[PDB]
Amino acid sequence: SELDAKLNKLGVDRIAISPYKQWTRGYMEPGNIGNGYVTGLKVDAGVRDKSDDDVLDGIVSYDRAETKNAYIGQINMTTAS
Amino acid sequence: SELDAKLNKLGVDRIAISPYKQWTRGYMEPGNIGNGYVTGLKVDAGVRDKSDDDVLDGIVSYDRAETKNAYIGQINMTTAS
Amino acid sequence: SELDAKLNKLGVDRIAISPYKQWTRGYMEPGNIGNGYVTGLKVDAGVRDKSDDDVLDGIVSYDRAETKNAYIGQINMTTAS
Amino acid sequence: XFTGVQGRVIGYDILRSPEVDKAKPLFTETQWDGSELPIYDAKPLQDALVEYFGTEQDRRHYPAPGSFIVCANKGVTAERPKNDADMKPGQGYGVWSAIAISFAKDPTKDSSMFVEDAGVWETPNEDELLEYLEGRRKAMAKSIAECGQDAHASFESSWIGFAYTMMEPGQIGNAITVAPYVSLPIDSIPGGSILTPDKDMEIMENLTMPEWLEKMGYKSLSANNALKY
Amino acid sequence: XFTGVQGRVIGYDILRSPEVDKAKPLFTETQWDGSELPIYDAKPLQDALVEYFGTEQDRRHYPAPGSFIVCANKGVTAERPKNDADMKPGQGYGVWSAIAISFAKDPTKDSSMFVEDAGVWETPNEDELLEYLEGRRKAMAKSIAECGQDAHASFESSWIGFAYTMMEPGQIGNAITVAPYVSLPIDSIPGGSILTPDKDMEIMENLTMPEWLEKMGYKSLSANNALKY
Amino acid sequence: XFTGVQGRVIGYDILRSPEVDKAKPLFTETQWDGSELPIYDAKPLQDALVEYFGTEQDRRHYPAPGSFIVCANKGVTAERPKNDADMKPGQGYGVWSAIAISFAKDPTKDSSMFVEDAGVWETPNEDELLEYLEGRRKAMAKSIAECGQDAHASFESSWIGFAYTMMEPGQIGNAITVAPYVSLPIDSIPGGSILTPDKDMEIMENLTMPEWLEKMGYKSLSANNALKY
Numbered sequence: 001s002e003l004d005a006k007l008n009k010l011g012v013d014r015i016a017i018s019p020y021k022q023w024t025r026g027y028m029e030p031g032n033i034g035n036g037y038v039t040g041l042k043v044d045a046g047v048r049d050k051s052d053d054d055v056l057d058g059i060v061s062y063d064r065a066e067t068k069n070a071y072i073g074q075i076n077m078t079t080a081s
Numbered sequence: 082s083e084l085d086a087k088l089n090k091l092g093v094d095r096i097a098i099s100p101y102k103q104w105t106r107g108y109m110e111p112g113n114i115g116n117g118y119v120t121g122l123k124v125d126a127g128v129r130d131k132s133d134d135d136v137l138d139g140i141v142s143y144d145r146a147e148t149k150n151a152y153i154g155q156i157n158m159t160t161a162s
Numbered sequence: 163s164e165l166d167a168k169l170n171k172l173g174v175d176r177i178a179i180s181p182y183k184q185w186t187r188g189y190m191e192p193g194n195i196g197n198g199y200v201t202g203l204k205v206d207a208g209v210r211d212k213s214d215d216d217v218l219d220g221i222v223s224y225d226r227a228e229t230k231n232a233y234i235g236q237i238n239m240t241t242a243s
Numbered sequence: 244x245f246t247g248v249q250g251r252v253i254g255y256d257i258l259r260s261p262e263v264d265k266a267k268p269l270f271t272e273t274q275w276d277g278s279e280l281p282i283y284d285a286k287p288l289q290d291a292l293v294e295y296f297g298t299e300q301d302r303r304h305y306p307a308p309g310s311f312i313v314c315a316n317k318g319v320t321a322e323r324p325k326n327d328a329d330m331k332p333g334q335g336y337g338v339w340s341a342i343a344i345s346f347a348k349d350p351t352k353d354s355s356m357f358v359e360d361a362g363v364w365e366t367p368n369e370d371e372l373l374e375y376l377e378g379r380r381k382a383m384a385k386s387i388a389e390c391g392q393d394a395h396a397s398f399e400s401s402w403i404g405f406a407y408t409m410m411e412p413g414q415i416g417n418a419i420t421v422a423p424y425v426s427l428p429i430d431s432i433p434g435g436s437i438l439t440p441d442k443d444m445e446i447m448e449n450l451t452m453p454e455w456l457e458k459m460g461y462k463s464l465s466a467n468n469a470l471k472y
Numbered sequence: 473x474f475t476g477v478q479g480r481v482i483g484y485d486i487l488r489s490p491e492v493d494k495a496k497p498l499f500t501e502t503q504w505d506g507s508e509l510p511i512y513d514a515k516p517l518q519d520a521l522v523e524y525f526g527t528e529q530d531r532r533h534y535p536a537p538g539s540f541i542v543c544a545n546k547g548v549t550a551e552r553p554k555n556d557a558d559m560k561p562g563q564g565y566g567v568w569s570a571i572a573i574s575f576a577k578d579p580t581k582d583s584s585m586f587v588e589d590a591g592v593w594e595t596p597n598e599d600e601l602l603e604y605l606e607g608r609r610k611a612m613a614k615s616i617a618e619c620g621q622d623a624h625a626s627f628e629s630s631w632i633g634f635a636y637t638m639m640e641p642g643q644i645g646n647a648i649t650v651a652p653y654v655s656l657p658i659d660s661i662p663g664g665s666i667l668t669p670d671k672d673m674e675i676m677e678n679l680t681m682p683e684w685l686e687k688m689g690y691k692s693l694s695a696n697n698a699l700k701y
Numbered sequence: 702x703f704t705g706v707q708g709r710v711i712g713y714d715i716l717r718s719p720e721v722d723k724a725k726p727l728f729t730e731t732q733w734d735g736s737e738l739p740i741y742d743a744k745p746l747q748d749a750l751v752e753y754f755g756t757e758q759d760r761r762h763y764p765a766p767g768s769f770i771v772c773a774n775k776g777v778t779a780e781r782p783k784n785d786a787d788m789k790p791g792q793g794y795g796v797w798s799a800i801a802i803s804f805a806k807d808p809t810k811d812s813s814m815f816v817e818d819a820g821v822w823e824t825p826n827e828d829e830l831l832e833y834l835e836g837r838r839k840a841m842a843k844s845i846a847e848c849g850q851d852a853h854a855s856f857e858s859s860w861i862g863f864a865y866t867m868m869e870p871g872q873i874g875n876a877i878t879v880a881p882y883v884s885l886p887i888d889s890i891p892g893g894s895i896l897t898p899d900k901d902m903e904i905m906e907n908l909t910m911p912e913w914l915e916k917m918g919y920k921s922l923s924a925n926n927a928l929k930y
Contacts, residue, residue: 001448006351011101012248012765015440018426019197020173023307024296027424028109028190028769031197033440035100035112037424039246039315040253040292041285043340043406043472045418048618050322053608054415055546055589056615058320061417063619065318069470070296071305072423073623074474074583076242076544076653078313080157080244080424080769082714082906085899087809091183093536093706096898097884105754105762107770108882109190109540114898116181116193118882120704120773121711121750122743124798125930126866126876129389131780134379136317136360137386139778142875144390146776150928151751152763153881154394155245155354157315157424159771161238161540161702161882163677168580174307174477177669180655186525186533188541189653190311195669199653201475201544202482202521203514205569205635205701207647210847212551215837216644217775217818218844220549223646227547229851231699232522234652236537236703236812236852238882240771242311242473242544242653247767299623308583309476311542311653313769354766394757424769528852537812538705540771540882 012036026078044068093117107159123151174198188237206230244315244422247354252344254291255402257447258455262287272384272401275392278348282384285342285404289472290465291452295431298464304431306423318419319361325413335363337372339407340418343383345391345398353396358386359420369409376405406472433458473544473651476583481573483520484631486676487684491516497629501613504621511613514571514633518701519694520681524660527693533660535652547648548590554642559594566593566601568636569647572612574620574627582625587615588649598638605634635701662687702773702880705812710802712749713860715905716913720745730842730859733850740842743800743862747930748923749910753889756922762889764881774879777819783871788823795822795830795867796874801841803849803859811854816844817878827867834863864930891916 004014015034018025027037046064048057067073085095096115099106108118127145129138148154166176177196180187189199208226210219229235246252254260268281297303306312321335330336340361347353360383364372380403387401410416427447429435433455435443447455456463464470475481483489497510526532535541550564569590576582589612593601609632616630639645656676658664662684664672676684685692693699704710712718726739755761764770779793798819805811818841822830838861845859868874885905887893891913893901905913914921922928 001445003350004444007248009102010248010351013441014249014251015444016426017435017437017440017443018173018428019437020307020428022172022304022428022430023310024304024428025307025310025426026312027426028111028313029197029311029426030190030194032111032426033437034426034444035110036249036251036444037246038251038253038257038427039422039424040295041288041342041344041402041404041422042292043289043342043404043418043420045338045340045406045408045416045472047408047410047414047416050325050413050415051611051614053589053591053611054320055591056587056611057415058417059587060615060618060622061320061415062318062419063622065417065419067299067622069298069472070293071299071302072296072312072421073299073305074308074476074585074625075306076309076311076474076542077316077421078159078240078242078311078542080159080313080315081317082903084808088706091706091809092181094899095707095709096902097707098895098898098901099765099884099886100895101765101886103762103886103888104765104768105883105885106765106768108884109192109771110769110884113192113884114895115884115902116191117707117709117902118704119709119711119715119885120880120882121753122746122800122802122860122862123750123879123881124747124800124862124864124877126796126798126864126874128866128868128872128874131783131871131873132382132385134360134362134382136362137358137382138873139875140358141386141389141393142778142873143776143877144393146875146877148393148757150756150930151754152757152760153754153770153879154757154763155247155356155396155766156764157245157313157767157769158774158879159240159313159769161240161771161773165579166673169477172477172580175670176478176480177673178480178655179666179669179672180536180657181666182536182657184533184657184659185536185539186541186654186656187536187539189655190542191540191655194655195666196655196673198478198480198673199475200480200482200486200656201651201653202524203517203571203573203631203633204521204650204652205518205571205633205648207567207569207635207637207645207701209637209639209643209645212554212642212644213840213843215818215820215840217820218816218840219551219644220646221816222844222847223549223644224547224648225848225851227646227648229528231527231701232518232525233528233531233534234525234541234650235528235534236705236814236854237535238538238540238703238771238773239545239650240540240542242542245767248765250767307477308581309474309479352766536706537810538703538708 042070125149204232244357245354253295254288258452260287260291260452272388274388274397276397280398281400283402285402288402289404290470293464293470304428313424314421315357316421317359317361320417321363322415323410323412335365336367337364337409338416338418340420341379341405342420343401343403345387345401348397348399357422358383361418473586474583482524483517487681489516489520489681501617503617503626505626509627511630514631517631518633519699522693533657541652544586544651546588546590549646550592551644552639552641564592564594565596566636566638567645567647569649570634571649572630572632574616574630577626577628586651587612590647702815703812711753712746716908716910718745718749718910730846732846732855734855738856739858741860743860746860747862748928751922770881772879772881773815775817775819776877778875779821780873781868781870793821793823794825795865796876797865798876798878799863800878801859801861803845803856806855806857815880816841819876
């Protein structure tokens with residue numbers, strides 16, 4: 001867009017291309033082309049019946065929220081705050 | 082520094098150059114030149130008047146500590162521990 | 163492996179080489195060769211005698227756990243969940 | 244959080260949803276510089292990410308198995324007791340999460356920002372939670388204007404959206420809010436090539452979500468409000 | 473978490489321990505597709521990582537000082553009081569951690585998965601903590617089976633291992649569970665060259681841990697069940 | 702956290718602060734090897750980072766908007782109630798944070814180390830908080846020496862610094878301690894080029910902070926004890 005011409009003069013680019021077939025990849029994983037990134041919005045909820053272990057109950061209900069609607073199952077989530 | 086002569090013999094370098102005009106960038110971001118990093122010290126405190134929402138109060142007072150004195154406003158913070 | 167032949171057809175490779183003498187480095191650090199990673203298993207426990215300060219007690223007992231058995235001391239650990 | 248000078252947002256900047264241009268603001272917020280900030284429901288944007296990534300039964304350009312995806316994220320957990328009238332302070336009847344994206348008026352110097360929120364609901368009545376949630380949009384708009392003032396950033400719009408679940412007796416609920424930061428594969432780009440990196444991003448920026456769905460031969464997963472969070 | 477299409481695991485995929493081959497399952501779990509998941513003890517895998525990294529007194533190919541190593545990690549602290557019979561909320565007699573790796577039957581489609589757990593032990597008797605830990609393997613195996621069903625991933629085997637400590641009065645214990653994601657140095661590779669990175673991964677796939685110890689001239693730190701966690 | 706074989710610290714290794722060489726130790730700590738570790742106040746280093754990044758009002762070479770900056774960081778939040786004499790669990794009068802960097806004697810073998818600490822102050826009197834804060838400097842130095850022993854690393858010096866705020870009734874305080882890991886832009890390097898990367902770091906090493914401010918045409922923001930934390 002006209003924005004990329006102003007950005008490019010500053011040394012910035014918005015290119016974010018994955019070298020894989022079908023799959024997106026994370027920003028900063030080695031092998032992506034470009035120094036930009038793309039983002040999007042996911043809010044979802046998941047449940048699990050209560051067990052004797054809060055940590056495992058936590059893990060599974062999280063995993064169900066990740067797997068609900070837009071699929072981001074089996075990714076290693078790093079946190080930016 | 083003489084130390085670098087020693088470090089480069091081990092395959093290590095401390096070069097950490099950002100390709101942007103004006104702005105620093107973080108270690109591991111795509112497009113930096115060199116495989117080292119630079120660090121520094123920031124300790125600061127921010128406040129917000131209390132509201133009904135603890136998460137939002139945590140967000141704005143954090144933002145105020147980030148933006149006070151050494152400016153690190155508007156960055157995505159990743160934690161190393 | 164034969165797995166790698168199937169994987170390379172998708173754009174994926176599991177190569178993970180550190181440029182340093184003797185030392186391993188982490189996935190995504192600048193200067194590693196290849197786009198894969200290697201992982202492993204570490205469970206350990208460490209102790210400290212209780213002081214006035216919980217944060218410091220947690221830091222030292224943590225460092226004691228990192229330093230016991232498979233050595234991972236003096237690293238910056240970022241969390242994937 | 245933040246998406247700045249390096250970013251674009253699915254459903255808005257690339258693969259734009261038509262319901263974005265047709266949306267009306269729910270209310271406006273005043274910013275430090277006296278401009279009004281319109282607040283919109285983010286549902287077009289939530290939906291757009293389901294169109295691109297796919298669902299678990301109909302997987303499309305989802306993240307690779309075992310990849311590392313940095314996410315701006317928060318979440319909350321709460322238990323509904325299996326047979327107790329007394330909720331102890333970590334417990335509740337429902338759980339909810341929220342995400343807000345605010346686009347900078349000037350993206351070459353200010354970053355766009357996400358504020359995220361999550362919490363527990365203490366009433367068995369879902370209509371009351373929905374009333375509360377419209378009030379969290381005002382609370383989040385208020386914190387966006389304060390974060391803006393702190394960095395003297397002015398924003399053009401905010402799109403806030405929610406998810407929730409009421410749990411049954413003896414369930415734990417987890418409500419999560421996440422903004423993934425990713426790389427796009429060539430096969431999701433109609434006419435893209437690994438050899439034309441810059442041109443690939445222009446293609447995606449020029450297609451709206453209907454057009455992209457057509458070019459790929461994919462049905463619309465979100466079409467007659469099929470998706471609920 | 474997960475180790476997927478990009479990963480290999482020390483002591484299984486590269487430098488595999490002969491104890492992985494001689495190991496018998498402790499029990500099996502049924503997966504969503506009806507197959508049986510054999511659960512094993514992960515000790516051969518834990519031991520392999522200390523052969524590779526070395527220990528603090530016998531350092532081998534450990535992470536560089538000051539490096540950034542991303543880890544699937546979890547941890548728990550608890551305090552034992554100096555002279556109090558009554559134990560309050562963040563307190564206990566011992567602290568324990570756990571890691572489970574579950575290998576995917578089809579690694580080109582499904583990621584392999586880590587489940588981690590950690591908790592506080594509330595009796596002073598160590599034999600009771602060990603019985604409870606055998607019960608946590610079953611708990612973790614049910615977790616694995618449910619997560620597997622979420623993504624329809626089928627697994628070949630799970631290897632679950634534990635660490636723990638019992639505190640003396642007035643001590644704080646920290647039990648951590650960590651899966652590091654690393655790059656291997658050329659000199660840990662008999663025959664490797666920086667110029668042959670593809671061949672270098674192959675060399676390590678083909679060496680067994682005894683064969684690598686011998687080609688490197690390293691004594692075995694695991695040898696006669698020498699390592700306790 | 703740690704700054705190791707890859708790192709340099711603003712104010713000490715590059716753009717060295719004059720006040721670092723005039724500084725006198727507050728006290729010494731003995732280390733596992735018998736040497737004395739001198740402890741200094743970190744104010745010259747803390748000041749050196751605001752000279753480089755600038756302030757929100759006078760922005761210099763701060764991180765790109767929306768960049769991802771990995772930071773060794775901790776924080777603490779506490780509420781001071783609007784009109785209540787009784788303070789519950791997450792409540793206090795003030796909030797403090799601290800950072801300590803201690804430099805390795807042999808930086809090719811050992812890493813330099815960060816320890817960070819934060820907490821809630823429970824009396825309304827700021828003079829009692831500051832005496833407490835000098836006690837934390839000794840507590841932190843004890844921590845430093847034990848972490849050094851675990852890894853048999855000797856340090857040459859430690860620089861500890863603090864930040865705090867006292868809250869008014871009905872306020873939330875948030876004290877944070879952050880060490881960013883960054884890469885430096887060419888225009889902050891007098892005589893630098895994108896074509897001369899090693900020379901670029903040597904220029905920053907040889908410049909002292911006054912000389913750099915002179916070369917850049919920048920006013921000192923630190924000058925006559927102006928910055929307070």
